[PDB]
Amino acid sequence: TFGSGEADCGLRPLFEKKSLEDKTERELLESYIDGRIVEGSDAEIGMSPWQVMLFRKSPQELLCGASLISDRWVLTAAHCLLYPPWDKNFTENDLLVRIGKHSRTRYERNIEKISMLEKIYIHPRYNWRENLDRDIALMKLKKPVAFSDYIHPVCLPDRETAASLLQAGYKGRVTGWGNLKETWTANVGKGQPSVLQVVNLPIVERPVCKDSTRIRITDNMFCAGYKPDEGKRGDACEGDSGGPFVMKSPFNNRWYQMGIVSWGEGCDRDGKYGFYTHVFRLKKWIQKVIDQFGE
């Protein structure tokens, strides 16, 4: 009964289970949006238990974000492992996952768990040639992981959750170590987090998304971000490529993963957004690598 449903998904040991709220979750909780545009504070300990860190064995580097959905399965962006134009083509043995982390650089003794990958499953139809369509990969751990106060799975959405939550005006939440900030000409100061960060962004209407990029946007993608303007606290660019985009159901109080951080736009000063893979549309793919896979 792996990711074919998971009972405890999205109820966080330190918040929901103790009837405790994080310092910003009410924002997700409006229905209307106009208003609290929170900046991108540091995460609270246990605020995001499903957060994963893809780690390059050697040279030891933080490759991307990822999310815990089972005790044996991790979800990321396929571009994190396979991207011909950049000679990117990772294998099982080239990475490790790191679950249970806050600090970006410390090994976190007695908290994090580092595991090996057994197999990587890229969607057969992911499109690196043009726009990164079907940017989803699944990694099955080399051995199951024990949930902790710090380590817990997020829920995968179902038809109705996707239907009611995925909507223009509704805030979602990204978390990550800011690997979406992969500059050159930059002089990244007041940055490169020490600790995991968090920001709540509003989902954007399809046409407004299409009309801000030159990229051909498909049905498998959504965009979120505040309106390039005067006061726009919160940046998409604040996450990690392959990391999680999540909403808290107002019906059942659980946390589901609605998107995977795909690319960001005008990640500099020009008012663009973040693009994410639409988890609900790719879900039957997921449904079956799992329901029928492992090695």
Binding site: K57, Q60, E61, L96, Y107, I114, M116
Partner: peptide, 10 residues
């Protein structure tokens, strides 16, 4: 920046 992780994970 990355602190070294146990030789046991490679």
């Amino acid at each position: 920046d990355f602190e070294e992780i146990p030789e046991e994970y490679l």
